């Protein structure tokens, strides 16, 4: 039996959690109580499979069981369309929503939250899991469990502290930020596996793993990246139980082979399964051995370049990226992979041209301008970030990227531009030796979110091209783009600017979000004449909103001065 095996390996509680996040990812709009009952029934049946491995349905697969369980009340609807199939799993996964119309989480006060957490922390943590996974349907299944344990620790500490609210707000913000980072990074792995292939994913994971553990053998990281590609294959295909079990088994194998990998794993393996898997998942980069010679001896000056590459090209290039990455933790993964593709094409064209050795002796000349452009842009953009701050950074980036692609929906423009602005708060704070890595990897993640949001409703052709071609050339692609002229400017309409009075009661974050959305409409309506007039109008917005909010009128000054500043703004 399958369910009996998973239940033996994963335990009852973790089982309940993984089933709950499964149903919360497949059914995002469904209320919580239904998920409670369904998880209860699933565990109820799994215990029976553990008692008798030959029971009626215990020989069935997981997808058949879960689909059968979902189509009892899920036929109430476009989720009854997949229930007319048996293909059904791929239908369900296709009907996942990357951007669901779910609010950005409502939070009660401190004492009510502590009352709910004390009252029953099972339903409390389960509610947290449901609310997190229902907005992020492509979250790493075990990592969500560990983050749930961190949530448990947060409430356990703050409900016994001096002031529960002051203790609880910044911690909730912290775990929120880390959780959104984990979900943002995981969305790129499922985008590489489902759309770019285990070849591309294996290249990426080989680059990062070689950067993290330079002391390991190439065969070790080859088998390891194979296994990792397997477990992420299962997590991206909705196979959450076998993904969690396989992750636990991988952590076990790594802890049984400490000498063969690194020296930074001594204190990670002395933790519970999820603390172990998180600890390993972000352990600091290891030191480099001493028995390493020059790369040019084996990969440029060597005489076996064409014959060895012709014997096994994927293993050859994998060894190339392995040797290049383990000596450069200061490069981004995308940079290393771009260099690997340039080397691949070089070996593809030189071994057939006039003289192989002579012309592939000039690879470094090709490698010079590829490393320059990233560091140039992290220099320039960290300069701008330090000059303007995070808010002005997001604003200037909104100018740049609205002029880049004016066909994009405004919530996606602002949503991607603010996360773009967070790269200065995240990476420019680090020393310059860890700037390009953090920076470019983060940028490829953000642009990945942009491409998976543009995939739902394509609108611009250039976005389509820069999202379809190469996964690694994604960040450079967007940098090569500039102002678009196929777009015809939008006319100021009776909807683009007349907002409402409740804006005075909303917090500063959403107020700045509205400021930037109106700024996006401003940029779209007239992209050319956009000198200091953008700032001149953007300041008048704040002047009007503040002077009218600070009047305590019963929604009069807003409707009055609303129809004025649309024409006063069109005149500028």
UniProtKB/Swiss-Prot annotation:
Function: Binds water, Ca(2+), Na(+), K(+), fatty acids, hormones, bilirubin and drugs. Its main function is the regulation of the colloidal osmotic pressure of blood. Major zinc transporter in plasma, typically binds about 80% of all plasma zinc. Major calcium and magnesium transporter in plasma, binds approximately 45% of circulating calcium and magnesium in plasma. Potentially has more than two calcium-binding sites and might additionally bind calcium in a non-specific manner.
Modification after translation, per record: Phosphorylated by FAM20C in the extracellular medium.
SUPFAM superfamilies to which the protein is assigned, alphabetical: Serum albumin-like
Primary location class: secreted
Self-association state and partner proteins as the record states: Interacts with FCGRT; this interaction regulates ALB homeostasis. Interacts with TASOR. In plasma, occurs in a covalently-linked complex with chromophore-bound alpha-1-microglobulin; this interaction does not prevent fatty acid binding to ALB.
Keywords of this entry: Allergen, Calcium, Cleavage on pair of basic residues, Copper, Disulfide bond, Lipid-binding, Metal-binding, Methylation, Phosphoprotein, Repeat, Secreted, Signal, Zinc
Record SMART domains: ALBUMIN (SM00103)
Protein family according to the UniProt entry: Belongs to the ALB/AFP/VDB family.
Modified sites of kind Phosphothreonine: 410, 412, 536
Name recorded for this polypeptide: Albumin
Cellular component annotations (GO), alphabetically ordered: cytoplasm; extracellular space; protein-containing complex
Modified residues (N6-methyllysine): 524
Transferase is among the record's keywords: no
């Amino acid at each position: 039996s399958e369910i009996a095996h998973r239940f033996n390996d994963l335990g009852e509680e973790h089982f309940r959690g993984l089933v709950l996040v499964a149903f919360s990812q497949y059914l995002q709009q469904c209320p919580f109580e239904d998920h409670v009952k369904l998880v209860n029934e699933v565990t109820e049946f799994a215990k029976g499979c553990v008692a008798d491995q030959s029971a009626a349905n215990c020989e069935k697969s997981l997808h058949e069981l879960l689909g059968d369980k979902l189509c009892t009340v899920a036929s109430l609807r476009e989720m009854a369309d997949c229930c007319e199939k048996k293909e059904r799993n791929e239908c369900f996964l296709q009907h996942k929503d990357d951007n669901p119309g779910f609010g950005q989480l409502v939070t009660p006060e401190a004492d009510a939250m502590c009352t709910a957490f004390h009252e029953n922390e099972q339903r409390f943590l389960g509610k947290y899991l449901y609310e997190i996974a229902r907005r992020h349907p492509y979250f790493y299944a075990p990592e969500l469990l560990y983050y749930a344990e961190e949530y448990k620790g947060v409430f356990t500490e703050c409900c016994e502290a001096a002031d529960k609210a002051a203790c609880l707000t910044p911690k909730v913000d912290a775990l929120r930020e880390k959780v959104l980072a984990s979900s943002a990074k995981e969305r790129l792995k499922c985008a590489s596996l489902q759309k770019f292939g285990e070849r591309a994913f294996k290249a990426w994971s080989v680059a990062r793993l070689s950067q993290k553990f330079p002391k390991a053998e190439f065969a070790e990281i080859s088998k390891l990246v194979t296994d990792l590609a397997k477990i992420h294959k299962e997590c991206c295909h909705g196979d959450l139980l076998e993904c969690a079990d396989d992750r636990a088994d991988l952590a076990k194998y790594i802890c049984e082979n400490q000498d063969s990998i690194s020296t930074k794993l001594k204190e990670c393996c002395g933790k519970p399964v999820l603390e172990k898997s998180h600890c390993i998942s972000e352990v600091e980069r290891d030191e480099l051995p001493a028995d390493l010679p020059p790369l040019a001896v084996d990969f440029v000056e060597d005489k076996e370049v064409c014959k060895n590459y012709q014997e096994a090209k994927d293993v050859f290039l994998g060894t190339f990226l392995y040797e290049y990455s383990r000596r450069h933790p200061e490069y981004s993964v995308s940079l290393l992979l771009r260099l690997a593709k340039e080397y691949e094409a070089t070996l593809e064209k030189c071994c057939a041209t006039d003289d192989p050795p002579a012309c592939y002796a000039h690879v470094f000349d090709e490698f010079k301008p590829l490393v320059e452009e990233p560091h140039n842009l992290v220099k320039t953009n960290c300069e701008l970030f330090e000059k303007l701050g995070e808010y002005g950074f997001q604003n200037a980036l909104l100018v740049r990227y609205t002029k880049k692609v004016p066909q994009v929906s405004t919530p996606t423009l602002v949503e991607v531009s603010r996360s773009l602005g967070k790269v200065g708060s995240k990476c420019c704070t680090h020393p310059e030796a860890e700037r390009l890595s953090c920076a470019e990897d983060y940028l490829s993640v953000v642009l990945n979110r942009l491409c998976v949001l543009h995939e739902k409703t394509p609108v611009s052709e250039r976005v389509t091209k820069c999202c379809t071609e190469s996964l690694v050339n994604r960040r450079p692609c967007f940098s090569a783009l500039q102002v678009d002229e196929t777009y015809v400017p939008k006319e100021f309409s009776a909807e683009t600017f007349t907002f409402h009075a409740d804006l005075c009661t909303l917090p500063e974050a959403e107020k700045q979000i509205k400021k930037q959305s109106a700024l996006v409409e401003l940029l779209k309506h007239k992209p050319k004449a956009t000198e200091e007039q953008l700032k001149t109008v953007m300041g008048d917005f704040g002047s009007f909103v503040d002077k009218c909010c600070a009047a305590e009128d019963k929604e009069a000054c807003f409707a009055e001065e609303g129809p004025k500043l649309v024409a006063a703004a069109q005149a500028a």
